[PDB]
């Protein structure tokens, strides 16, 4: 997260770190046995780490659970990143409490202007790599479809939305992919891609979760 602030330990209880010996992506806990992340974060050997703040220190509240299966959306396109969503089923359910909680899926899509919270352990520099130990947060608004399409002509599908600041300075970045974009208590997006990080007129692009709720529900109900 570039231009954000330190969240404060366990203030984002639905945030998870996907780990394979190092942190490579974020994700969101939506119930006690399922996590939603981005399809491009898929790999084998995933350990899901819940209740984290400093990802390099066991401070207490952590729960490390292996993924039993990861379900990449069947129409995921790795060239356009269209349908960049994945569901991960945990080997055992997690113990929910005030430090580990799930986030609700939305019933409707959000409108431009909506203020959301984006978080993660990704790079905090736009020009260079500085990875934090604790979780960073950024409050950012959803942009209108026209500004998004004018920024990325021909690359935005109906399953994506832009959020951020066109003046540059604040954005999600590498290491944040797969994580949450929460607006009014509902998970509206998943960190997907962007051109550089925090560059002028190149906002972050997110997977539009409201378009996949029936798919998430039906898939979880059958697995
Ligand atoms: N400007 C943004 N808003 C933004 C958001 C998420 C991002 N993720 C990345 C990213 C960069 C290199 C590798 C990965 C990656 C690749 C495979 C698996 C996991 C992460 C990224 O997600 C860049 C990147 C940029
Ligand atoms: Ca820790
Ligand atoms: Cl277009």
Name the helix (H) or strand (E) containing 28.
strand 23-29
Residue from 5, 182, 195, 171 nearest 81 by CA: 195
Name the method of structure determination.
X-ray
Query: Hey, whose CA ends up nearest to atom 21 of ligand 1?
Result: 174
120 lines ligand 1 (CB under 6 A): no
Can you read off the two tokens belonging to residue 103?
Answer: 């986030």
What resolution does the deposited structure have, in angstroms? Answer: 1.5
163 lines ligand 1 (CB under 6 A): no
- Cα–Cα distance, 32 to 186 (Å, whole number): 16
Catalytic residue among 28, 102, 177, 192: 177
Catalytic residue among 84, 102, 119, 176: 84
Catalytic residue among 23, 28, 40, 102: 40
Which DSSP symbol is given to 190? Answer: E
199 lines ligand 1 (CB under 6 A): no
Between β-strands 15-19 and 47-50, what pairing exists: parallel, antiparallel or unpaired? antiparallel
172 annotated as belonging to a binding site for a ligand? yes
Ligand with an atom nearest the CA of residue 140: 1
201 annotated as belonging to a binding site for a ligand? no
131 lines ligand 1 (CB under 6 A): no
Residue from 10, 58, 26, 34 nearest 176 by CA: 26
- Cα–Cα distance, 191 to 195 (Å, whole number): 13
Q: Taking CA 40 as the corner, what is the angle to CA 129 and CA 115, rounded to the nearest 5 degrees?
A: 70
Q: Could you give phi then psi for residue 65, rounded to 5 degrees? A: -130, 140
41 lines ligand 1 (CB under 6 A): yes
- Cα–Cα distance, 213 to 10 (Å, whole number): 26
Q: Which residues pair with 206 in a beta bridge?
A: 161, 191
- Could you give the strand order of the β-sheet that contains 204-208, starting from the edge strand earlier in sequence? 5-6, 136-141, 115-120, 180-183, 186-193, 204-208, 160-163
All residues at 6 or more sequence positions from 35 whose CB lies less than 8 Å from its CB, including other chains: 16, 18, 27, 28, 29, 48, 67, 87, 88, 90
Instruction: Give all domains of the chain, ordered by start, each with its CATH number.
Output: 1-12+103-210 (2.40.10.10), 13-102+211-223 (2.40.10.10)
Can you read off the two tokens belonging to residue 167?
Answer: 């003046």
CB neighbour burial string for 179-198, b if at least 16 within 10 angstroms, e if fewer:
bbbbbeebbbbbbbbbeebb
Can you read off the two tokens belonging to residue 182?
Answer: 């929460």
Query: Hey, whose CA ends up nearest to atom 18 of ligand 1?
Result: 41
Cβ neighbours, 10 Å, residue 100:
21
Question: Active site includes 66?
Answer: no
């Amino acid at each position: 997260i570039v231009g954000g602030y330190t969240c404060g330990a366990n203030t984002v209880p639905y945030q998870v770190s996907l780990n394979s010996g190092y942190h490579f992506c974020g994700g969101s806990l939506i119930n006690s046995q399922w996590v939603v992340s981005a399809a491009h974060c898929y790999k084998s050997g995933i350990q899901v780490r819940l209740g984290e703040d400093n990802i390099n220190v066991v401070e207490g509240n952590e729960q490390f659970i292996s993924a039993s299966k990861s379900i990449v959306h069947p129409s995921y396109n790795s060239n356009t990143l269209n349908n960049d969503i994945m569901l991960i089923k945990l080997k055992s359910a997690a113990s929910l409490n005030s430090r580990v909680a799930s986030i609700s899926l939305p019933t409707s899509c959000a409108s431009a202007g909506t203020q959301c919270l984006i978080s993660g352990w990704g790079n905090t520099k736009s020009s260079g790599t500085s990875y934090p130990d604790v979780l960073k947060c950024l409050k950012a608004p959803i942009l209108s479809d026209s500004s998004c399409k004018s920024a990325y002509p021909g690359q935005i599908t109906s399953n994506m939305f832009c959020a951020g600041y066109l003046e540059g300075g604040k954005d999600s970045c590498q290491g944040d992919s797969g994580g949450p974009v929460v607006c009014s208590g509902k998970l509206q997006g998943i960190v997907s891609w962007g051109s550089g990080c925090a560059q002028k007129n190149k906002p972050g692009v997110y997977t539009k979760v409201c378009n996949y709720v029936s798919w998430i529900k039906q898939t979880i109900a059958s697995n």
